[PDB]
Scaffold this active site. Sequence first.
Site, PDB file in Angstrom:
ATOM      1  N   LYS A  23       0.842  -1.190   0.000  1.00 62.18           N
ATOM      2  CA  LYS A  23       0.000   0.000   0.000  1.00 62.18           C
ATOM      3  C   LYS A  23       0.873   1.235   0.000  1.00 62.18           C
ATOM      4  CE  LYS A  23      -4.213  -1.906   2.043  1.00 62.18           C
ATOM      5  NZ  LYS A  23      -3.870  -3.329   1.737  1.00 62.18           N
ATOM      6  N   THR A  76     -20.117   6.561  14.089  1.00 60.00           N
ATOM      7  CA  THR A  76     -19.199   6.173  15.163  1.00 60.00           C
ATOM      8  C   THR A  76     -18.418   7.366  15.742  1.00 60.00           C
ATOM      9  OG1 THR A  76     -17.308   5.553  13.740  1.00 60.00           O
ATOM     10  CG2 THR A  76     -19.006   3.887  14.120  1.00 60.00           C
ATOM     11  N   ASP A 134      -8.708  15.598  25.367  1.00 63.78           N
ATOM     12  CA  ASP A 134      -9.572  15.693  26.533  1.00 63.78           C
ATOM     13  C   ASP A 134      -8.760  15.757  27.840  1.00 63.78           C
ATOM     14  OD1 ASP A 134      -8.624  13.190  27.201  1.00 63.78           O
ATOM     15  OD2 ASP A 134     -10.569  12.190  27.166  1.00 63.78           O
TER      16      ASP A 134
HETATM   17 MG    MG Z   1      -9.731  10.573  28.263  1.00 65.85          MG
HETATM   18 MG    MG Z   2      -6.787  12.347  26.937  1.00 62.95          MG
END
Ligand code: MG
Ligand code: MG
Length: 326
Positions: A63, A92, A181
Amino acid sequence: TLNGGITDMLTELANFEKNVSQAIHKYNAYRKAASVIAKYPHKIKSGAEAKKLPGVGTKIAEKIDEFLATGKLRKLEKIRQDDTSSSINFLTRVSGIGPSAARKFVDEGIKTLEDLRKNEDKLNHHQRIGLKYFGDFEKRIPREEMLQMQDIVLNEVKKVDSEYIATVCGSFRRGAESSGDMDVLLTHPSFTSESTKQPKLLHQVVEQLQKVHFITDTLSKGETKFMGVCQLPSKNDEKEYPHRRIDIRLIPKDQYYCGVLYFTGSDIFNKNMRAHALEKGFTINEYTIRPLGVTGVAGEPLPVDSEKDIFDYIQWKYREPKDRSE
DNA sequence: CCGACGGCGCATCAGC
DNA sequence: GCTGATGCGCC
DNA sequence: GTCGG
Ligand SMILES: [Mg+2]
Ligand SMILES: [Mg+2]
């Protein structure tokens, strides 16, 4: 990012195998390959050169040759044209919708952001909040905002009980300039591997953070793990900050080093390290490192008084968090 | 040629 | 209700 | 999809 085009191709292939094919090992193989290529300090000139790396095999070598030759992958071009695949890959992206749910929704004719927004009653709690903050959740968090968030979390925890220790882990602890996050590891002396001398330890903390309007939503919550949503306060007349994902994990205090090793990651670093421990005859989880006995059964927890002790056991030189971004 | 691939928390559900 | 499987998520 | 025995 010498090989950004290749690593994206592999990541997109990984996502396909996970989201559409529901082939978890192919998913992991593609991500191991992308990750080994990502850290390779040369601009790759051929598939052969890439195949020398652990995790890149014949198929990926092929690939890579197609991609260098043409700038694209027909296999991916076809996937992108496939409506079902496209739809499943989109769904998703909502937290709480996985490969099975996405395919189920698509069957029902729920396949766009609009469809979802008119069928809220068909989502579980987690999915409903993931939908609610869909856009927000795909934004990254500048380190500066992560620092403000850290200050809030550490100070509110201290207000609950001066014996709590809260550590921000994840990409933040690895020194990233932006995080997906916020990951918070929590300890309290009342919760060890030996005893839980105090209930509601995680709850108390979550409640205080809700009280001050930092935590705004909950995706799930048990005795040792919270998964939710948080938001920085904004100044007078200022646009609000985006809502952010927050994960808080309460770990037995005597098990902090295994815990912080786990929560620092990266995820791929963790899989590689754990796989290597196995090869060396140990097993590592977020609590303990144990020997494998002749049988294949884990033995009693080996003594650990530093993150480095864990590396020592498996005969790896220590790697600072900033070097675990695999 | 294959068996193994990292390890585990919470939510949901089938079966009892 | 429980236990065990599965889905989804964390790194 | 790749690796190790
Ligand atoms: Mg997290
Ligand atoms: Mg994180």
